[PDB]
Paper text:
Amongst the Arabidopsis MSL channels, MSL10 is enigmatic in that it has two separable functional modalities, regulated cell death signaling conferred by its N-terminal soluble ‘death’ domain and force-activated ion channel activity imparted by its C-terminal portion. When heterologously expressed in Xenopus oocytes, MSL10 is indeed activated by membrane stretch and displays a preference for anions. In Arabidopsis, MSL10 is primarily expressed in the shoot apex, root tips, and vascular tissues, playing a critical role in adaptation to hypo-osmotic shock and induction of programmed cell death. Analogous to DmMSL10/FLYC1, each subunit of the heptameric AtMSL10 channel is composed of a transmembrane domain (TMD) with six membrane-spanning helices (TM1-TM6) and a characteristic C-terminal cytoplasmic domain (CTD) shared by all MscS homologs.
Of particular interest, transient overexpression of the G556V mutation, near the helical kink in TM6, in tobacco epidermal cells resulted in a well-expressed protein as assessed by confocal imaging and the planta cell death assay. However, recordings from excised membrane patches showed no detectable currents of G556V under applied tension, indicating that the mutation stabilizes a non-conducting conformation. To better understand the open-to-closed transition of AtMSL10, we determined the cryo-EM structure of G556V at a nominal resolution of ~3.5 Å. The global structure of G556V is almost identical to that of the wild type (r.m.s.d of ~1.1 Å for all Cα atoms). Importantly, pronounced local conformational changes occur at the F553 hydrophobic gate, though the pore-lining helices align well with those of the wild type and the helical kinks are maintained. Introduction of a bulkier hydrophobic residue, valine, at the position of G556 pushes the aromatic side chain of F553 toward the central pore axis. Consequently, reorientation of the phenylalanine side chain reduces the pore radius from 6.6 to 3.9 Å at the position of the F553 ring, which is now remarkably similar to the dimension of the corresponding F572 ring in the wild-type DmMSL10/FLYC1 structure (3.5 Å in radius). Together with the lack of activating currents of the G556V variant in excised membrane patches, we conclude that this conformation represents a non-conducting, closed state. The wild-type AtMSL10 structure has a wide-open pore, whereas a non-conducting mutant G556V renders a much narrower pore created by repositioning of the side chain of F553, which appears to constitute the hydrophobic gate in the closed state. Closure of the channel pore could be essentially accomplished by local adjustment of the side chain of a critical residue defining the narrowest pore, while the global conformations of the open and closed states are similar.
Author numbering:
A (entry chain B): 693 to 731
B (entry chain A): 248 to 334, 387 to 396, 432 to 468, 481 to 731
C (entry chain B): 495 to 643
Write the structure that this text describes.
Amino acid sequence: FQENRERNLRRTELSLAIKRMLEDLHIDYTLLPQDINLT
Amino acid sequence: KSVQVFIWLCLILVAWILLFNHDVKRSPAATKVLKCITRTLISILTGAFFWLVKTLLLKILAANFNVNNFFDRIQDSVFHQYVLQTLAWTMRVLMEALAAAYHVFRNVAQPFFNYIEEEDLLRFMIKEEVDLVFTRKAFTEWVVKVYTSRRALAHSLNDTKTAVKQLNKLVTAILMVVTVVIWLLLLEVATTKVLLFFSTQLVALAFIIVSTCKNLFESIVFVFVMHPYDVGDRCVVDGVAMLVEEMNLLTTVFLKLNNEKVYYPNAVLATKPISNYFRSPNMGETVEFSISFSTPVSKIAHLKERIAEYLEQNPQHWAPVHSVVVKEIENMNKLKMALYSDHTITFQENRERNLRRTELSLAIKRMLEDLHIDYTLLPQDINLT
Amino acid sequence: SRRALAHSLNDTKTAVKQLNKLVTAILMVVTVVIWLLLLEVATTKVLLFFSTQLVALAFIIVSTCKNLFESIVFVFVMHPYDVGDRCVVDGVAMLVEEMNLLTTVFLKLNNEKVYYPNAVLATKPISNYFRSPNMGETVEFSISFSTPV
């Protein structure tokens, strides 16, 4: 961890790679369904 | 002066003792008078030696601070003398040493001449000296900054001198009292029983002043030995920026961002971290922003390139070195990034730092606006009954 | 790395020189009082008064001498870090710049010069990045509970 800049750059690259990988796999997150009744 | 007085006193003492070494019983009463006189002479010799060691200690501490103190003072004095010409002995000179300055500088410079008048500098100093010393507005700002730095250095020197004077007064007081009791004991005016009672009373007094003497002495150690900050330097204590105004043996006047006068005991500071902005090198800065998780990597690359070009095209405020990082991903809805850059100055100039940070934030906002980057909340579905 | 090692060696030499100066001072004063006592220049009563004065001085410098000596112990015996090695104190990364008998210059991620007393560090954990082996990393992400295995 001495090379803070290099570690941060590598972590950013890993995060971007993970984001791309999730994008290709078609993985989505949805909130809890909510029901509404009118009066 | 101290050594001269010491040698004079020792020479007088030895001359008297050698002359009086004769064993003549002039009178039984005269023996007591001679004994008292020689006891007083040796007592004053001891007092002179104590004064000599006191001044030696004070001078060594003063010079330990004075290496840097007089370096800065000499630099400021040389700058001030050069400016005036264009328009120990060192300690005395340093002690002796705005709109008016700007007006004077403008008058010296040729009218309608933004650049520094080379002819004026040449007539006042050599070309090499003028170049080493070195826009009319920029020159005026530099002169004002130099004058402010010289004034701050003079104020710091005055505060250090006042603290040294207080310490000298305390040391002198203690040495007077110890030599007075030494003389009283050497004259055997009182008996032993009362002497022992007084010794016990002094022991009790010490046991009473335990806490105060300990706190004061550790305060001296913190002020001198540690020397974490000087006058006129902004420091962060307990995570809040604070500016040093005046330093004492037990009180340190501080000014916050809102000109809040705070008296911080020196003993407490000895157990807490202290950060100095003035001595620190060029400081960094962080800007926090978030953008949608679905943005293409091409937009991120374009943003990074534009940030690099903006930073490199303004070297006067930010250094070329920079870094764009991603902290963490939460709900994969927004990405957390921080922009790291190094300012051309320290954090002492709070107003300038804040203005530069505001300019950087506005620039980043504009850059995001041009790139067409938007953030949307998590989609929500609703079913009716 | 060579420049950092040279700077660390210079800092260690400066600390050793300060300790040598302190030790030399104390040994000069003790030998001076030894000589004065051996010459029996003064009487016993004043000698006892001076002994009591020295006892009072020690009782006054209790805290400072204790703190300084434990600082030496922490710097030398424990030896938790050297110059040029990044360390985490109280959960914040900090880079060592220079080490003294009572002051340790530190540089944070934003080049913040912080003077940390050595005595306080003796009662807090210290982490050294330079001496540690290859370090790990963690990345946090969340995905829908209904995704197939």
